[PDB]
Design a protein around this ligand. Structure first.
Ligand code: CLA
Ligand code: CLA
Ligand code: CLA
Ligand code: CLA
Ligand code: CLA
Ligand code: CLA
Ligand code: CLA
Ligand code: CLA
Ligand SMILES: CCCCCCCCCCCCCCCC(=O)OC[C@H](COP(=O)(O)OC[C@@H](O)CO)OC(=O)CCCCCCCCCCCCCCC
Ligand SMILES: CC1=C(C/C=C(\C)CCC[C@H](C)CCC[C@H](C)CCCC(C)C)C(=O)c2ccccc2C1=O
Ligand code: SF4
Ligand code: SF4
Ligand code: SF4
Lengths: 160, 739, 80, 171, 61, 41, 130
């Protein structure tokens, strides 16, 4: 399909990889005894390996000639769960972190001892700001509009 | 109102916990730049600059020692708890030669359960190379319940040491005169601590370890072995194994000590069953050590008209060549903690290296000589600790010279006379270092270039120009002839390394005569050269710590400073700290070469398997003799060859070793950013980053500053040491566990 | 020999003069500051370039500036 | 008693009077060496130094060279002799250039007195200054020293080769 | 400008260039740099105050 | 318990607690839903 | 024992001057002390002052000035440093006008003073080929 890849559900090398891993795990399982915790752990390993391979097969995942899932990150929504949705999730979380950090910096920057409140965090104010970051996309595009997001010329510059 | 302690000196309060940097006069005002954060941790234990009173520094040091001992006790309790709960110690007891010791199981997350190896005995976990199983077996511990109780005792002891530290800083802190009773302290540490510890351990060995281990070697399973207390309440369970307890303590008090030859032997060699030292020999050794140390503890005058005064001993040791001699040394060592730390750390690291040597040379634990990973790990770890401690001793000698050295109090004594001719010492040490390096390494390079040019008869090899270590071979011959000639009451040599028979346990070689040829000559001279260069750097740091021809007032700049400026052609790293930094680098080099020599020589010419007919086949096959004489040989037949197990560990239970190999390479390369660069570039880059932050109104109030020059060097050396030592750690462990 | 220049931002706090290890700087009368004194560099032939002088300068970007130049046995700090 | 004292009663020199720097054995031993033996012209000093140096220099080249022989070989001896002679030539070249760039004097122990008496208001470093008063510290003296070193090196190398051949043949 | 006034530093070779500081005292004598300004951010040398000329400071509204 | 709570509000203790909590919920997500290469939806 | 009676009671160190301070220049520091105090040499170790005139020779001006700075801790202030060329060419150096450089003395002219701040320095491109 895309880039010459093929779905992993029809990739023979993918099933060969699964079979080889299961065979190695079973051979390891053979050298232990009865329902002893080592055998239980190896059986859990086998079950998890089978579940992971089955989930990857039924996941709209494209496999190359090596039988490994390749990620299609050109931007198409068909393979949108590989990069685009995790990209949105990370952008949300990281914007949350950056927004709460910036808000805390600007909030304790207007107190008597701004530097003290950076090594000794005001946990009440920190908790107040941190749970308010869920609106960071909206807060950012409400502070940029008001001109409160960017400094203009009070920023310092070197000699040249 | 005791005469030794002050009651309730410091109030137990949490107020100062909420004021970081309260100890320092400069840091107490609060952070203004990020340099304050780093200065906070760099001055935490520098008690000299926190108080102007030696008494307060001594009390802080005493409580810090208690905290450290509590940490050590907690670590030991954790080790015993892991042995009790997450180990295959019981399975290893019944099959020491076929079960690999494991005492740490790994949770099944993110696929990391592959690290749980097939250590044997129906167990999965990480193979343990600390030799705790062999130590516990030598202690007579035959059940995991005993390990649990030892862990509980360790936890109780750790809490006790924590309470002792709190008590002796906040409730009853000793006075300076108590700390300065070096005669009483030496008497107690020599008699009580050392001698009575040896005596108590000899008692434990004789009454618990001797019978239990004898029964274990006889084939008695641990379940039918009597509980250790039964060997004390019943004089018949121990009198069957050693038929001399039937006479009781009467032979001891009647001076008929020959009766106790059953369990106080002098045999030498190794136990043929376990491959370790005879535990009867060990008990006799500890008894003799106890008596010697108890006797040695009655030397210094403490509270009666009896004993020696160290001041009078030192002041009487003058000479024509040494002026006032040792006059003033007693005042130096009773008023400066740094001098005591220097001496103790240097001798402590040297002792650690000696311990490392004597460990593999004469394996003291049952079934530890045939556990090659344990032997390699123990040697390498102890040599590393020794090198670090020696560098620390040099560092604190330099610190004493900078800070606690008084010129007036040391007029024409040994310290003064050493400083007065420091040039001669350093110049001759420089010449010796150049001579040794030229010779050792250039003989290596000559061998390499002769081999590369197809001239095999021009090498410094055994089948070529030969450099036989005749002096060491003479000593080896003297030791193998000692039993019956110079040690007439010995039955076997102290170690089979000096010569004798091949000692094998379960077809695995425990010890064997270590032949010394031209390959050992070159590597020994390499060791001497590296040690001499490290000594050169550290001694130049100590002697030139106060002044020099460059900076006549270097003592006024302190122990730790980056430079005096770009003038005089450049005055980088003139400190004494910058000498403990370079000396750390050279100690890493020396110890790395030492452990490489040990690993290759043991794998190639000691360790291996013995055929039923007596044919010895080694791990590598004797390639050390002919291929360790060239740098290409070290690169190929040792590094490239034995790195195969590390690089091929992916997908196996040793994959963590490959991951740590790669990560240690990454950290070592990361160090070079700090070692090669300078502070100005990073400060000017932080300037633009701060511009961006200010543009987005997110510049922190604590102004971000690049790490200071000294801190940049410290970070570089710490990362370099961590990366190199971790790379060697992963390489050694994967190689010696795979094969 | 190195070059040492003094700038009128001098506040006459004398910290440069009492930090010079080779007696290069000295305090001379002036009328451009409250202290009525300004640093001078009349013995730059003894200047070693250690830059202790400008490490003790409290003014914003320094009032004493050391420009390293030609080297001499005095400026190289050679006891031999 | 103390066996280390400041050198010549000067506590500010970078030197000490140890039982090695200023011992009678050191005095006599250094005064019998060609470099300091009294009554020797610079040519004689150079000749003796060259003889001794070639004599002990032929040794390592012949014994450990690229053409060694566990038995006696004329080719090995010739190789060692040629290597020693060429090394002496290199050392003589170094001596010649060192003397060329170091001194500008033809008669010492006088010019110093002349400029200490009759004034030295000139470009200095030739009239004034002048380190050392030995005859070896002149352009003429060092030239003859190098010539003697070179000739004596050749002669001593040849003598040592002859001795090595005799020892290997008749013993 | 006077004591307590807020000024912007116009000196280019300044750790507080384009930044705002508080005037501590303006000297009335014939000194070259009478204006003494205190800042909240310490410079690279650790100081937080400096003397500025009359044309190197601009009062904030 | 006024200065102890202030000590717990210091940067190292707060960072250690936050990173321990963060690693904790990450590890537990990866335990309950392991081997997640793509978005579950 | 020593060449001169005013020398400090120093046992000599292999850190003193070398052949340079016999043909290029040597520095001498003189001072008078009330007590025979024990002080640390800038070169080697501990020396003993004379209860009176003290004279010390060094290879660098910095060594003499470090010794003088140490002397200030002994409440010694009258120390004076001279430069001696290969012959007896004595030149007073440190108390040049009899007043220490840290104290303002009349009769001193500013040397190396620029009537502008750092920002007034000319651009290097305009200082090419001169
Ligand atoms: C939490 C606040 C915060 C915010 C909003 C930003 C924002 C920014 N940083 Mg930044 N930074 C921060 C903290 C922050 N940083 C910290 C703590 C450090 C020290 C490690 C840095 C080091 C740094 C460098 C070296 C660079 C930036 C750069 C940037 C810019 C591009 C984004 C980027 O590369 O991220 C960079 C982010 C990191 C390197 C990791 C930050 C470390 C953690 C995640 C942040 C700290 C969280 C904090 C403790 C939360 C506490 C708040 C709570 C008490 C309420 C952007 C202006 C770049 C730039 O100038 O581009 C224009 C750049 O080169 N920053
Ligand atoms: C000081 C040495 C030391 C070290 C290095 C360890 C290290 C370890 N212990 Mg441990 N332990 C120690 C002392 C030590 N312990 C002591 C003294 C005791 C007795 C109380 C225990 C009792 C103990 C138990 C009962 C268990 C461990 C477990 C573990 C492992 C997982 C730890 C973890 O995820 O906790 C995370 C901790 C936090 C997030 C708290 C912050 C880890 C290898 C666990 C293990 O191996 O699981 C299989 C486990 O179950 N330990
Ligand atoms: C709850 C008990 C308690 C309380 C409230 C205090 C309270 C105090 N102690 Mg104290 N102390 C205690 C127990 C306690 N101590 C114990 C058990 C010991 C023995 C180790 C000491 C030893 C001690 C010394 C030697 C000193 C103090 C000092 C102080 C004062 C300042 C402490 C500070 O800011 O550092 C707070 C520091 C910490 C919280 C760091 C804890 C460090 C631990 C031990 C490291 C363990 C980490 C572990 C090894 C893993 C590493 C990775 C303060 C009054 C100082 C003082 O009064 O002088 C001005 C001082 O010099 N204490
Ligand atoms: C026979 C008596 C005796 C014994 C056994 C010890 C033992 C010890 N002393 Mg000690 N000491 C003694 C007498 C004694 N001292 C006297 C008389 C003085 C006064 C001059 C000192 C002054 C002194 C100082 C100043 C320091 C020590 C330190 C140490 C420890 C060294 C660390 C070590 O080797 O770890 C071995 C550890 C163990 C074997 C663990 C078990 C040891 C336990 C704690 C028994 C300790 C015995 C104790 C003195 C009994 C007092 C109990 C109390 C209720 C009165 C060690 C525990 C150093 C240290 O670490 O500080 C804590 C230290 O800095 N001692
Ligand atoms: C008995 C051992 C001992 C003791 C008591 C001391 C005590 C002291 N040393 Mg010292 N030192 C030692 C051993 C010791 N040292 C050794 C072995 C070396 C050689 C490396 C040195 C080298 C040394 C130098 C070069 C200096 C000191 C200094 C000091 C003083 C301040 C220490 C401080 O505040 O650090 C606080 C503690 C820290 C900053 C911890 C830093 C963290 C380390 C560097 C990294 C450890 C990594 C660890 C192994 C884990 C890595 C694993 C990775 C995967 C994460 C103090 C008196 C300093 C001083 O000014 O003395 C007056 C100083 O300049 N020491
Ligand atoms: C492979 C890299 C390398 C090498 C070769 C050296 C070599 C040396 N270091 Mg070291 N060093 C290194 C890395 C290295 N270092 C690193 C990374 C650091 C950073 C921490 C240091 C830090 C350091 C310090 C701090 C000190 C040294 C010192 C020394 C010298 C010890 C004396 C000696 O053996 O001289 C003999 C020279 C050699 C063994 C090099 C090879 C020479 C060959 C084999 C023989 C001669 C070849 C011949 C002349 C070639 C002629 C032909 C040619 C003209 C074409 C020596 C020059 C010490 C010193 O100054 O010397 C006493 C010292 O104090 N080093
Ligand atoms: C701080 C983050 C964090 C979070 C959000 C959770 C969340 C959870 N843990 Mg948990 N846990 C954590 C850290 C965390 N854990 C740590 C650090 C440990 C020690 C290593 C554990 C040990 C642990 C155990 C032993 C169990 C949980 C269980 C659980 C679940 C039910 C409660 C829940 C999903 C329970 C569960 O769901 O298992 C069935 C359970 O039995 N946790
Ligand atoms: C920086 C690059 C990077 C990226 C993009 C990833 C991405 C991924 N890694 Mg990975 N990893 C990295 C670096 C990276 N890793 C490094 C440096 C290491 C070495 C330590 C690892 C070691 C590692 C292991 C050992 C494993 C992964 C796994 C995973 C996958 C599962 C992620 C997960 O737990 O989601 C689930 C968790 C979240 C989405 C957390 C966010 C949830 C919040 C609470 C939502 C709340 C708001 C609504 C994912 C594809 C796992 C896997 O299955 O691989 C396919 C796995 O087993 N990684
Ligand atoms: C080894 C030489 C040795 O230790 O002899 C010992 C020799 C004798 O000195 P003293 O008789 O003065 O020592 C008496 C007291 O100081 C006891 O230490 O010491 C020296 O002279 C140091 C010179 C080292 C020279 C290095 C070669
Ligand atoms: C990069 C660099 C800096 C800048 C480095 C800085 C500012 C350090 C920043 C450290 C951050 C802010 C905290 C550490 C973050 C790590 C992720 C934590 C360590 C990892 C743990 C597992 C220990 C210098 O200041 C410097 C100075 C002198 C010589 C070389 C250099 C140099 O190379
Ligand atoms: S900064 Fe680096 S180079 Fe410049 S002086 Fe200090 S150390 Fe020497
Ligand atoms: S460099 Fe700076 S300090 Fe050193 S002398 Fe010249 S001016 Fe005085
Ligand atoms: S340094 Fe700047 S401020 Fe300090 S004295 Fe010299 S000139 Fe005046």
């Amino acid at each position: 399909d895309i880039g010459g890849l093929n779905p992993c559900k029809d990739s023979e090398v993918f099933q060969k990889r699964l079979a080889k891993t299961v065979k190695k795990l079973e051979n390891r399982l053979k050298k232990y005894e009865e329902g002893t915790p080592p055998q239980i752990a190896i059986q859990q390993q086998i079950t998890q390996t089978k579940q992971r391979f089955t989930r990857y097969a039924d996941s709209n995942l494209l496999c190359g000639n090596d039988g490994l899932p390749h990620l299609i990150t050109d931007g198409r929504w068909s393979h949108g769960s590989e990069f685009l949705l995790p990209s949105i999730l990370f952008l949300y979380i990281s914007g949350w972190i950056g927004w709460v950090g910036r808000k805390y910096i600007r909030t304790v920057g207007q107190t008597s001892n701004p530097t003290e409140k950076e090594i000794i965090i005001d946990v009440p104010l920190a908790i107040s700001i941190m749970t308010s970051g869920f609106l960071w996309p909206f807060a950012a595009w409400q502070e940029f509009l008001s001109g409160d997001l960017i400094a203009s010329d009070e920023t310092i510059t070197t000699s040249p | 109102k005791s005469t030794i302690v002050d009651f309730n000196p410091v109030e137990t309060s949490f107020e100062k916990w909420a004021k970081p940097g309260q100890f320092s006069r400069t840091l107490a005002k609060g952070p203004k730049t990020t340099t304050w954060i780093w200065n906070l941790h760099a001055d935490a234990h520098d008690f000299d600059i926190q108080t102007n009173s030696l008494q307060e520094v001594s009390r802080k040091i005493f409580s810090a020692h208690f905290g450290q001992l509590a940490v050590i006790f907690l670590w030991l309790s954790g080790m015993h708890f892991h042995g009790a709960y997450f180990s295959n110690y019981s399975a290893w007891l019944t099959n020491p030669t076929s079960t690999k010791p494991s005492a740490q199981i790994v949770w099944p997350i993110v696929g990391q359960e592959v690290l749980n190896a097939d250590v044997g005995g129906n167990f999965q976990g990480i193979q343990i190379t600390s030799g705790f199983f062999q130590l516990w077996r030598a202690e007579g511990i035959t059940s995991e319940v005993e390990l649990y109780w030892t862990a509980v005792g360790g936890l109780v002891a750790s809490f006790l040491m924590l309470f002792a530290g709190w008590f002796h800083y906040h409730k009853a802190a000793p006075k300076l005169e108590w700390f300065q009773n070096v005669e009483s302290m030496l008497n107690h540490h020599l008699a009580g601590l050392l001698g009575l510890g040896s005596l108590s351990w000899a008692g434990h060995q004789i009454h618990i370890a001797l019978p239990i281990n004898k029964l274990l070697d006889l084939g008695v399973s641990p379940e039918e072995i009597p509980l250790p207390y039964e060997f004390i309440l019943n004089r018949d369970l121990i009198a069957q194994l050693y038929p001399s307890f039937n006479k009781g303590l009467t032979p001891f008090f009647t001076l008929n000590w020959g009766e106790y030859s059953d369990f106080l032997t002098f045999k030498g060699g190794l136990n043929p069953v376990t491959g370790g030292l005879w535990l009867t020999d060990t008990a006799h050794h500890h008894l003799a050590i106890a008596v010697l140390f108890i006797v040695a503890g009655h030397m210094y005058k403490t509270n009666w008209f009896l004993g020696h005064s160290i001041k009078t001993i030192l002041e009487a040791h003058k000479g024509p060549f040494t002026g006032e001699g040792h006059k003033g040394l007693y005042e130096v060592l009773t008023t400066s903690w740094h001098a005591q730390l220097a001496i103790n750390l240097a001798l402590f690291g040297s002792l650690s290296i000696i311990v490392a040597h004597h460990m593999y040379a004469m394996p003291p634990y049952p079934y530890i000589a045939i556990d090659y990973p344990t032997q390699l790990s123990l040697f390498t770890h102890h040599v590393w600790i020794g090198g670090f401690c020696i560098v620390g001793g040099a560092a604190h000698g330099a610190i004493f010279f900078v800070r606690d050295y008084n010129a007036a109090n040391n007029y024409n004594n040994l310290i003064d006379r050493v400083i007065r001719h420091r040039d001669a010492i350093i110049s001759h040490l420089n010449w010796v270092c150049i001579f040794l390096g030229c010779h050792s390494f250039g003989l290596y390079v000559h061998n390499d270039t002769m081999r590369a040019l197809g001239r095999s008869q021009d090498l410094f090899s055994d089948n070529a120009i030969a450099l036989k270590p005749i002096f060491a071979q003479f000593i080896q011959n003297l030791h193998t002839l000692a039993p019956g000639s110079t040690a007439p009451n010995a039955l076997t040599t102290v170690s089979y390394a000096f010569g004798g028979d091949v000692i094998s346990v379960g077809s695995k070689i425990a010890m064997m005569p270590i032949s010394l040829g031209t390959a050992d000559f070159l590597v020994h001279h390499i060791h001497a050269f590296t040690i001499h260069v490290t000594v050169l750097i550290l001694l130049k740091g100590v002697l030139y710590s106060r002044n020099s021809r460059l900076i006549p007032d270097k003592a006024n700049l302190g122990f730790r400073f980056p430079c005096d400026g770009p003038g005089r052609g450049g005055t980088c790293q003139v400190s004494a700290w910058d000498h403990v930094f370079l000396g750390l680098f050279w100690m890493y080099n020396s110890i790395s070469i030492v452990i490489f020599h040990f690993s290759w020589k043991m794998q190639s010419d000691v360790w291996g398997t013995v055929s039923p007919t007596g044919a010895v086949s080694h791990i590598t096959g004797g390639n050390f003799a002919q291929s360790s004489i060239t740098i290409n040989g070290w690169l190929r037949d040792f590094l490239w060859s034995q790195a195969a197990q590390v690089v091929q560990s992916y997908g196996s239970s040793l994959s963590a070793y490959g991951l740590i190999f790669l990560g240690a390479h990454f950290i070592w390369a990361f160090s070079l950013m700090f070692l090669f660069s300078g502070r100005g570039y990073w400060q000017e880059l932080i300037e633009s980053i701060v511009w961006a932050h200010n543009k987005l109104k997110v510049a922190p109030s604590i102004q971000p500053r690049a790490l200071s020059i000294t801190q940049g060097r410290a970070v570089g050396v710490a990362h370099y040491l961590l990366g190199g030592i971790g790379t060697t750690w992963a390489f050694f462990l994967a190689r010696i566990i795979s094969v | 020999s190195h070059t040492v220049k003094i700038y009128d931002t001098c506040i006459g706090c004398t910290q440069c003069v009492r930090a010079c290890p080779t007696d290069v700087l000295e305090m001379v009368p002036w009328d451009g500051c409250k202290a009525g004194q300004i640093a001078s560099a009349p013995r730059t032939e003894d200047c070693v370039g250690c830059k202790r002088c400008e490490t003790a300068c409290p003014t914003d970007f320094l009032s004493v500036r050391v420009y390293l130049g030609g080297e001499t046995t005095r400026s190289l700090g050679l006891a031999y | 008693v103390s066996f280390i004292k400041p050198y010549r009663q000067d506590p500010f020199v970078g030197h000490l009077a140890t039982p090695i720097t200023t011992s009678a054995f050191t005095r006599a031993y250094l005064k019998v060496l060609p470099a300091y033996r009294p009554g020797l012209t610079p040519l004689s000093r150079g000749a003796e130094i060259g003889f001794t140096h070639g004599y002990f220099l032929i040794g390592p080249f012949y014994t450990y060279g690229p053409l060694r022989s566990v038995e006696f070989s004329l080719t090995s001896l010739a190789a060692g002799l040629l290597a020693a002679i060429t090394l002496l030539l290199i050392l003589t070249v170094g001596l010649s250039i060192y003397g060329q760039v170091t001194y500008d004097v033809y008669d010492n122990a006088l010019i110093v007195k002349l400029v200490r008496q009759m004034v030295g208001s000139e470009r200095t470093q030739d009239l004034p200054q002048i380190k050392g008063t030995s005859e070896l510290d002149t352009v003429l003296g060092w030239q003859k020293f190098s010539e003697g070193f070179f000739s004596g090196g050749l002669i001593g190398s040849i003598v040592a080769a002859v001795g090595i051949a005799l020892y290997s043949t008749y013993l | 400008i006077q004591k307590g006034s807020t000024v912007r530093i116009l000196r280019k070779e300044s750790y507080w260039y384009n930044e705002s500081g508080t005037v501590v005292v303006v000297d009335q004598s014939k000194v070259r740099y009478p204006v003494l300004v205190r800042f909240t951010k310490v410079n690279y040398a650790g100081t937080n105050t400096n003397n500025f000329g009359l044309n190197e400071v601009e009062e904030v509204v | 318990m006024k200065d102890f709570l202030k000590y717990l509000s210091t940067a190292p203790v707060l960072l250690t607690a936050w990173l321990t909590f963060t690693a904790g919920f990450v590890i537990e997500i990866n335990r309950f839903y392991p081997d997640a290469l793509t978005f579950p939806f | 024992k020593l060449k001169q009676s005013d020398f400090p009671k120093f046992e000599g160190s292999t850190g003193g001057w070398l052949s340079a301070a016999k043909n290029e220049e040597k520095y001498v520091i003189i001072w008078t002390s009330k007590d025979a105090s024990l002080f640390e040499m800038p070169t080697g170790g501990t020396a003993k002052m004379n209860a009176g005139n003290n004279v010390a020779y060094f290879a660098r001006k910095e060594q003499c000035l470090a010794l003088g700075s140490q002397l200030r801790g002994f409440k010694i202030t009258n120390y004076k440093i001279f430069r001696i060329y290969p012959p007896l060419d004595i030149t007073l150096l440190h108390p040049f006008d009899g007043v220490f450089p840290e104290k303002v003395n009349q009769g001193r002219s500013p040397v190396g003073k620029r009537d502008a701040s750092i920002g007034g320095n000319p651009n290097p491109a305009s200082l090419k080929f001169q």
